[PDB]
């Protein structure tokens, strides 16, 4: 069996699944039938570029695990780390939190520019 590989860590906990992000990251990129294949490749490239742009805008460019300055609001979730990182799966967490997605993205986006401005001001001196 090939239990471990690519998506094999889907059923494991978030802590255990956090050690195998690279296997998922690698595969995201790779007459009538050729047209369909080209369309699919174009869509895949667009999706990959969208994901890369979203990662870069938040300042975590070229990083798989990147914790940031935005604090966690208790309203979005109340469970503690004890019952999350070793007592839950990534799919369950995404299902629970899928409603609260865009607000954190906006918070990261507006937080990155302040850090950039402060760095520029510090380097001005």
């Amino acid at each position: 069996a090939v239990f471990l590989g690519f998506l094999g860590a889907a059923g494991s906990t978030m802590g255990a699944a956090s050690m195998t992000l690279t296997v998922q990251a690698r595969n995201l990129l790779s007459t009538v039938w050729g047209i369909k294949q080209l369309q699919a490749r174009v869509l895949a490239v667009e999706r990959y570029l969208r994901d890369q742009q979203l990662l870069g805008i938040w300042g975590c460019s070229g990083k798989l695990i990147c914790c940031t300055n935005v604090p966690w609001n208790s309203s979005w979730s109340n469970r503690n780390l004890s019952e999350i990182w070793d007592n839950m799966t990534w799919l369950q967490w995404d299902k629970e939190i899928s409603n609260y997605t865009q607000i954190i993205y906006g918070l990261l986006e507006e937080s990155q520019n302040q850090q950039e401005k402060n760095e520029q001001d510090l380097l001005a001196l």
Binding site: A10, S30, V32, W33, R47, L81
Partner: protein, 441 residues
């Protein structure tokens, strides 16, 4: 106290349902493998441990994609072939009375007609042999398709033999396969795996019987979207196949008539020797055992003390009323009346013979205005096939009567494709994720 902060993870194993376009993977034919990618000699599959996924075979877009692709390939294959437009002429036909039996009297007509030639200002008188199902009286007859649309002739070089084809999803997507036996195509499958491409699926076109299909690994399986409702078909999958031997024993002869510059029409010159009906043979004991297993399984859903009846088809077009298939280019339509004829009550070497007919003007898909004239095949033909499933329909079903009557079904080709892709689904990955974590930037 908690002092947590947001953190972004790239490559989280999360997937969502989605629809996309799949592409080829395969090892002169209608199912063109020239524009299909080669298959890897060592396919890879990853079993997902402790992962259960919802499945529903009756909402699969893969079936629609397969149907559309098959129709597109069929249309493409016939583009570079001769169009039989001049054939719509007044024929003069007589009955064939040369060494025929008592059942094939009037089944063949010897017709004569004028036709064009390579030169624009010349004509030639020719003759041919036609089937009674192809000619309609206007001692004067015409092709049935003349008043509908002018249609073409299948090129003789291409072959109609099915070839297995694998479907592969693009990058950023995945195909989930349910390995749980006894899974009935709807519900939560607990045993799941990820596969880059599907297994070889033969696009076999047949009605009333699934031929050269896949066999259940445990026992006879019964599937239906809503078994209580009689309007939905029932798919029965066998755990063992049944051998069926079909044959046309007439020794046909082919001749070519030049109808224009670089245009030839292939006609049936004459039949050598005796003229007899084509027929199929099915084992009797094996069929009885298979029907016993089928009724045993059906008793689970439709009561334990009910009477289960197998009868003939209701009616309709010849394609839906009769088991329709093709062997070696010849299109057979056969009368499966001796098989589905029995009653079951709760409590050697003879073979069932189906004599049956052949057709040349074909409307394969449920479309109007396009034919496919099959050129004749030289010599006697025979083949052997595996019956591995059935499509059944419940007649009536009201509470007034406790006896259940099941009849043959078919017609729609999507049922044939649904029997192979019932354990497959497609999802798209969502690598990005957000979580709480102690560290701060």
């Amino acid at each position: 106290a908690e002092n947590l902060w947001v953190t972004v993870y790239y490559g989280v194993p999360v997937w969502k349902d989605a629809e996309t376009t799949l592409f080829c993977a395969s090892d002169h034919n209608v199912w063109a493998t020239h524009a299909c990618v080669p298959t890897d000699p060592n396919p890879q599959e990853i079993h997902l441990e402790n992962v259960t996924e919802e499945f529903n075979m009756w909402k699969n877009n893969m079936v629609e994609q397969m149907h559309t692709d098959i129709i597109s390939l069929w249309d493409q294959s016939l583009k570079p072939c001769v169009k039989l437009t001049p054939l719509c002429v007044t024929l003069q036909c007589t009955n064939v009375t040369n060494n025929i039996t008592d059942d094939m009297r009037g089944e063949l007509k010897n017709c004569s007609f004028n036709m064009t030639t390579e030169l624009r200002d010349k004509k030639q008188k020719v003759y041919s042999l036609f089937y009674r199902l192809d000619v309609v009286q206007i001692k004067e007859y015409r092709l049935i398709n003349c008043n509908t649309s002018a249609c073409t002739q299948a090129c003789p070089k291409v072959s109609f033999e099915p070839i297995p084809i694998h479907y592969c999803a693009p990058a950023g997507f995945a195909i989930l396969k349910c390995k749980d036996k006894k899974f009935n195509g709807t519900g939560p499958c607990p045993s799941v795996s990820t596969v880059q491409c599907t297994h070889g699926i033969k696009p076999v076109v047949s009605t009333q019987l699934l031929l050269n299909g896949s066999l259940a690994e445990e026992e006879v399986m019964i599937r239906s979207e809503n078994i209580t409702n009689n309007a939905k078909n029932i798919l029965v999958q066998f755990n063992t196949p049944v051998q069926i031997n079909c044959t046309r024993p007439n020794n046909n002869t082919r001749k070519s008539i030049r109808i224009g510059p670089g245009q030839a029409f292939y006609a049936t010159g004459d039949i050598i020797g005796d003229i007899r009906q084509a027929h199929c043979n099915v084992s009797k004991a094996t069929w009885n055992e298979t029907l016993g297993k089928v009724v045993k399984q059906l008793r689970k859903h439709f009561g334990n003390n009910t009477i289960i009846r197998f009868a003939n088809s209701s009616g309709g077009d010849l394609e839906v009323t009769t088991h329709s298939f093709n062997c070696g280019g010849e299109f057979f339509y056969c009368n499966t009346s001796g098989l589905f004829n029995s009653t079951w009550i709760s409590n050697s070497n003879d073979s069932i013979t189906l004599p049956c007919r052949i057709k040349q003007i074909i409307n394969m898909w449920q479309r109007i205005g396009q034919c496919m004239y099959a050129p004749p095949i030289q010599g006697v033909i025979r083949c052997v096939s595996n019956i591995t499933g059935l499509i059944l329909t419940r007649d009536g079903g009201s509470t007034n009567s406790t006896t259940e009557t099941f009849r043959p079904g078919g017609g729609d080709m999507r049922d044939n494709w649904r029997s192979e892709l019932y354990k497959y689904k497609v999802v798209k990955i969502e690598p990005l994720g957000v979580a709480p974590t102690r560290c701060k930037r």
